[PDB]
Coordinates of C-alpha atoms and ligand atoms in Angstrom, one line a residue:
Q1 CA 178.4 355.3 -54.1
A2 CA 175.5 355.5 -56.6
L3 CA 174.1 352.2 -55.3
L4 CA 171.9 353.8 -52.6
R5 CA 169.1 356.3 -53.3
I6 CA 168.5 359.0 -50.8
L7 CA 164.7 359.3 -51.2
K8 CA 162.6 362.4 -50.7
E9 CA 159.4 361.9 -48.8
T10 CA 157.4 362.6 -51.9
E11 CA 159.1 359.8 -53.8
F12 CA 157.4 357.0 -51.9
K13 CA 154.0 356.3 -50.5
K14 CA 152.9 353.8 -47.8
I15 CA 149.8 352.1 -48.9
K16 CA 149.2 349.0 -46.8
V17 CA 150.7 347.4 -43.7
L18 CA 152.8 344.2 -44.3
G19 CA 153.7 343.6 -40.7
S20 CA 155.0 345.1 -37.4
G21 CA 156.8 344.4 -34.2
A22 CA 159.2 345.9 -31.7
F23 CA 161.5 346.9 -34.6
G24 CA 159.0 349.1 -36.2
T25 CA 156.6 348.6 -39.1
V26 CA 156.8 347.4 -42.8
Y27 CA 154.5 348.9 -45.4
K28 CA 153.7 347.9 -48.9
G29 CA 153.9 351.0 -51.0
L30 CA 155.0 352.6 -54.2
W31 CA 158.3 354.3 -55.1
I32 CA 157.6 357.1 -57.6
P33 CA 161.1 358.4 -58.5
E34 CA 161.1 362.0 -59.5
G35 CA 161.5 362.6 -63.2
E36 CA 160.6 359.1 -64.1
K37 CA 157.3 357.9 -65.4
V38 CA 157.0 354.7 -63.2
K39 CA 155.5 353.5 -60.0
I40 CA 157.5 350.7 -58.4
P41 CA 155.9 348.3 -55.8
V42 CA 158.2 348.4 -52.8
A43 CA 158.3 347.5 -49.1
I44 CA 159.1 350.3 -46.7
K45 CA 160.5 349.4 -43.2
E46 CA 160.2 352.3 -40.8
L47 CA 162.3 351.7 -37.7
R48 CA 161.1 353.0 -34.4
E49 CA 162.4 356.4 -33.6
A50 CA 165.7 356.3 -31.7
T51 CA 166.3 358.6 -28.7
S52 CA 170.0 358.9 -29.4
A53 CA 174.7 359.5 -36.4
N54 CA 173.5 360.3 -39.9
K55 CA 176.9 359.7 -41.4
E56 CA 177.1 356.3 -39.6
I57 CA 173.6 355.3 -40.7
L58 CA 174.3 356.1 -44.4
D59 CA 177.6 354.1 -44.0
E60 CA 175.8 350.9 -42.9
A61 CA 172.9 351.5 -45.4
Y62 CA 175.6 351.9 -48.1
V63 CA 176.7 348.3 -47.4
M64 CA 173.1 347.0 -47.6
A65 CA 172.8 348.7 -50.9
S66 CA 176.0 347.2 -52.2
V67 CA 175.1 343.5 -52.1
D68 CA 174.7 342.0 -55.5
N69 CA 173.4 338.4 -55.3
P70 CA 170.1 336.8 -56.4
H71 CA 169.6 335.4 -52.9
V72 CA 170.3 338.4 -50.8
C73 CA 167.9 341.3 -50.6
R74 CA 169.4 344.7 -51.6
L75 CA 168.5 348.0 -50.0
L76 CA 167.2 350.3 -52.8
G77 CA 166.8 353.6 -50.9
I78 CA 166.7 355.3 -47.5
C79 CA 164.9 358.2 -46.1
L80 CA 166.2 359.9 -43.0
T81 CA 163.8 362.0 -41.0
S82 CA 162.9 361.6 -37.3
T83 CA 163.0 357.9 -38.3
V84 CA 165.0 355.7 -40.6
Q85 CA 163.0 354.3 -43.5
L86 CA 164.5 351.5 -45.6
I87 CA 163.0 350.8 -49.1
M88 CA 163.5 347.7 -51.1
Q89 CA 161.6 345.7 -53.8
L90 CA 158.4 344.1 -52.8
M91 CA 158.6 340.3 -52.2
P92 CA 155.0 339.5 -52.8
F93 CA 154.8 336.0 -51.3
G94 CA 156.1 337.3 -47.9
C95 CA 158.4 335.5 -45.4
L96 CA 159.3 332.0 -46.1
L97 CA 158.3 330.8 -42.6
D98 CA 154.7 331.9 -43.1
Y99 CA 154.8 330.7 -46.7
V100 CA 155.7 327.1 -45.7
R101 CA 153.1 327.1 -42.9
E102 CA 150.4 328.2 -45.2
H103 CA 151.3 325.9 -48.1
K104 CA 152.5 322.8 -46.2
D105 CA 150.1 320.3 -47.8
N106 CA 151.4 321.5 -51.3
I107 CA 155.2 321.6 -50.8
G108 CA 157.3 318.8 -52.2
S109 CA 160.9 317.8 -51.8
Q110 CA 162.3 319.6 -54.8
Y111 CA 161.0 323.0 -53.5
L112 CA 162.4 322.4 -50.0
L113 CA 165.8 321.4 -51.2
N114 CA 166.0 324.3 -53.7
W115 CA 165.3 326.7 -50.9
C116 CA 168.1 325.2 -48.9
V117 CA 170.5 325.7 -51.8
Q118 CA 169.4 329.3 -52.4
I119 CA 169.7 330.3 -48.7
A120 CA 173.2 328.7 -48.7
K121 CA 174.1 330.6 -51.8
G122 CA 173.0 333.9 -50.2
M123 CA 174.9 333.2 -47.0
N124 CA 178.1 332.2 -48.9
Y125 CA 177.9 335.5 -50.7
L126 CA 177.6 337.4 -47.4
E127 CA 180.5 335.4 -46.1
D128 CA 182.5 336.3 -49.2
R129 CA 181.7 340.0 -48.4
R130 CA 182.9 339.4 -44.8
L131 CA 179.4 340.1 -43.5
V132 CA 178.0 338.1 -40.6
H133 CA 174.2 338.0 -40.6
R134 CA 173.6 337.2 -36.9
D135 CA 169.8 336.7 -37.4
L136 CA 169.3 334.0 -40.0
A137 CA 166.0 332.2 -39.6
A138 CA 163.1 331.2 -41.8
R139 CA 161.3 334.4 -40.8
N140 CA 164.2 336.4 -42.3
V141 CA 164.0 334.8 -45.8
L142 CA 161.6 336.5 -48.2
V143 CA 159.8 334.9 -51.1
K144 CA 160.0 336.8 -54.4
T145 CA 158.4 333.9 -56.3
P146 CA 157.9 330.4 -54.9
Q147 CA 161.2 329.2 -56.3
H148 CA 163.2 332.5 -55.8
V149 CA 164.0 333.4 -52.2
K150 CA 166.3 335.9 -50.7
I151 CA 167.9 336.5 -47.3
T152 CA 167.0 339.8 -45.6
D153 CA 167.6 341.7 -42.3
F154 CA 171.4 341.6 -42.1
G155 CA 173.2 344.7 -41.1
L156 CA 170.3 345.8 -38.8
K157 CA 164.3 339.8 -28.0
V158 CA 167.6 337.9 -28.8
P159 CA 167.0 334.9 -31.1
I160 CA 168.4 332.4 -28.6
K161 CA 166.7 329.4 -30.3
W162 CA 168.7 330.1 -33.5
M163 CA 172.0 331.0 -31.9
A164 CA 175.2 328.9 -31.8
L165 CA 176.2 328.0 -28.2
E166 CA 179.3 330.3 -28.4
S167 CA 176.9 333.2 -29.3
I168 CA 174.7 332.5 -26.3
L169 CA 177.6 332.1 -23.9
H170 CA 180.2 334.5 -25.2
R171 CA 178.5 336.9 -27.7
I172 CA 180.8 335.5 -30.4
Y173 CA 179.3 335.9 -33.9
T174 CA 181.1 334.5 -36.9
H175 CA 180.3 332.9 -40.3
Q176 CA 180.3 329.6 -38.4
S177 CA 177.7 330.8 -36.0
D178 CA 175.7 331.7 -39.0
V179 CA 176.0 328.1 -40.1
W180 CA 174.4 327.0 -36.9
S181 CA 171.4 329.3 -37.6
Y182 CA 171.3 327.9 -41.1
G183 CA 170.9 324.4 -39.6
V184 CA 168.0 325.7 -37.5
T185 CA 166.5 327.4 -40.6
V186 CA 166.7 324.1 -42.6
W187 CA 164.9 322.4 -39.7
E188 CA 162.1 325.0 -39.8
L189 CA 161.6 324.3 -43.5
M190 CA 161.8 320.5 -43.1
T191 CA 159.1 320.6 -40.4
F192 CA 156.9 322.9 -42.5
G193 CA 157.5 325.7 -40.1
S194 CA 157.5 324.2 -36.7
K195 CA 158.7 326.2 -33.7
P196 CA 162.2 325.0 -32.6
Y197 CA 162.3 323.9 -29.0
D198 CA 158.6 324.8 -28.8
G199 CA 157.5 325.8 -25.3
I200 CA 161.0 325.7 -23.8
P201 CA 162.1 328.9 -22.1
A202 CA 164.9 330.7 -23.9
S203 CA 167.1 330.5 -20.8
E204 CA 166.9 326.7 -20.8
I205 CA 168.3 326.3 -24.3
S206 CA 172.0 326.4 -23.4
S207 CA 171.6 323.5 -21.0
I208 CA 169.9 321.5 -23.7
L209 CA 172.8 322.1 -26.1
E210 CA 175.4 321.5 -23.3
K211 CA 173.9 318.1 -22.6
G212 CA 174.2 317.1 -26.3
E213 CA 170.6 317.3 -27.2
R214 CA 169.6 318.9 -30.5
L215 CA 166.4 319.5 -32.5
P216 CA 164.9 316.2 -33.5
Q217 CA 165.0 314.5 -36.9
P218 CA 162.1 315.8 -39.0
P219 CA 159.9 312.9 -40.2
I220 CA 160.5 313.6 -43.8
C221 CA 164.3 313.8 -43.5
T222 CA 166.4 310.9 -44.4
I223 CA 169.5 310.4 -42.3
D224 CA 171.7 312.0 -45.0
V225 CA 169.8 315.3 -44.6
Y226 CA 169.6 315.2 -40.8
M227 CA 173.3 314.5 -40.6
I228 CA 174.0 317.8 -42.4
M229 CA 171.8 319.6 -40.0
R230 CA 173.5 318.0 -37.0
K231 CA 176.9 319.0 -38.3
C232 CA 175.7 322.6 -38.4
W233 CA 175.2 322.2 -34.6
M234 CA 178.6 320.9 -33.5
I235 CA 180.0 322.6 -30.5
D236 CA 183.3 323.1 -32.3
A237 CA 182.5 326.0 -34.7
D238 CA 185.3 324.9 -37.2
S239 CA 183.9 321.4 -37.5
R240 CA 180.6 322.8 -38.9
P241 CA 180.1 322.8 -42.7
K242 CA 181.1 325.8 -44.7
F243 CA 178.4 327.5 -46.7
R244 CA 180.3 326.5 -49.9
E245 CA 180.1 322.9 -48.9
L246 CA 176.4 323.3 -48.0
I247 CA 175.7 324.6 -51.6
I248 CA 177.4 321.6 -53.1
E249 CA 175.7 319.1 -50.8
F250 CA 172.2 320.5 -51.1
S251 CA 172.7 321.0 -54.9
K252 CA 173.5 317.3 -55.2
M253 CA 170.4 316.3 -53.2
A254 CA 168.2 318.6 -55.3
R255 CA 169.1 316.5 -58.3
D256 CA 167.3 313.5 -56.8
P257 CA 165.0 315.0 -54.2
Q258 CA 162.9 311.9 -53.5
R259 CA 166.0 310.0 -52.5
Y260 CA 166.6 312.5 -49.7
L261 CA 163.2 313.6 -48.4
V262 CA 160.2 311.3 -47.9
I263 CA 156.9 313.2 -48.3
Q264 CA 153.5 311.7 -48.5
Ligands
LIG1 C1 157.9 335.7 -41.3 C2 156.9 336.9 -40.8 C3 157.3 338.2 -41.6 O1 158.4 338.6 -41.7 N1 156.2 338.9 -42.1 C4 156.5 340.1 -42.7 C5 156.7 340.1 -44.1 C6 157.0 341.4 -44.7 C7 157.2 341.5 -46.1 C8 156.2 341.0 -46.9 N2 156.6 341.2 -48.2 C9 157.8 341.9 -48.2 N3 158.5 342.4 -49.2 C10 159.6 343.0 -49.0 N4 160.1 343.2 -47.7 C11 159.4 342.8 -46.7 N5 159.9 343.0 -45.4 C12 161.1 343.7 -45.2 C13 162.2 343.1 -44.5 C14 163.4 343.8 -44.3 C15 163.5 345.1 -44.8 C16 162.5 345.6 -45.5 C17 162.9 346.9 -45.8 N6 164.2 347.1 -45.4 N7 164.5 345.9 -44.8 C18 165.8 345.6 -44.2 C19 166.8 345.2 -45.2 C20 166.6 345.4 -46.5 C21 167.5 345.0 -47.5 C22 168.7 344.4 -47.1 C23 168.9 344.2 -45.7 C24 168.0 344.6 -44.8 C25 161.3 345.0 -45.7 C26 158.2 342.1 -46.8 C27 157.0 342.5 -43.9 C28 156.8 342.5 -42.5 C29 156.5 341.2 -41.9 O2 156.3 341.1 -40.5 C30 157.2 341.7 -39.7 C31 157.0 341.2 -38.2 O3 156.7 339.8 -38.3

């Protein structure tokens, strides 16, 4: 439908690099829609050129453009050339992982718990849309303003350290495996961006989980918060919390944040 703009190459301009990796490159730039009198700051993700589908691509992009939730990034436009370029609003404070690392000495309990609520709200919305994210992590949450974050990079180097055991062993991905990744994401935030299982080879992680070991209790977390994170990492997928429950629980904690996180 009319939710997704097919952009002409003249309608957007790459100005600065925001970041790059094996996926491709993201640029800060401007969207200059034809016949309008406006220049809109945007991010442009240019995927690496694929050797191998235009109808199929527009079909997936149409889904990314149809999400309508304050905590889920929405695709604004696409440009199909030798490459796929995806355009969305600029999120000026960057990814939440780097934001929490850079600002750790200045982040208090209310901020942290609000982020947990907002991420759970976005994932519950994706679940309501029958969309499984498959790569939720603090690096894939973007910061529009310090207390408005949004999930990105659904619909698009396997992220073993964020994966539910059944995803590692059987390539099963469900909303309940997303809940596992949500637990890991909360752990990243509560450790001010520490690396999960730091220094442990990816291929060792399944034996850690099989033995019953989990990521450790972050110093600032009271047992009530850590218990929620542990429940996200149950082997039985159906015994993990639902995102709806996570919203309610983190919303309750956000109402009395110093009862739940202990931050010097
Ligand atoms: C945590 C490290 C990191 O990710 N660094 C990083 C940040 C950005 C970045 C900074 N400000 C931004 N504003 C808006 N978008 C992005 N990135 C981004 C992410 C996903 C995108 C983008 C365009 N299209 N997609 C996919 C998508 C869009 C909408 C819905 C679903 C999916 C733009 C941004 C950029 C690059 C960065 O580094 C990358 C390697 O670490």
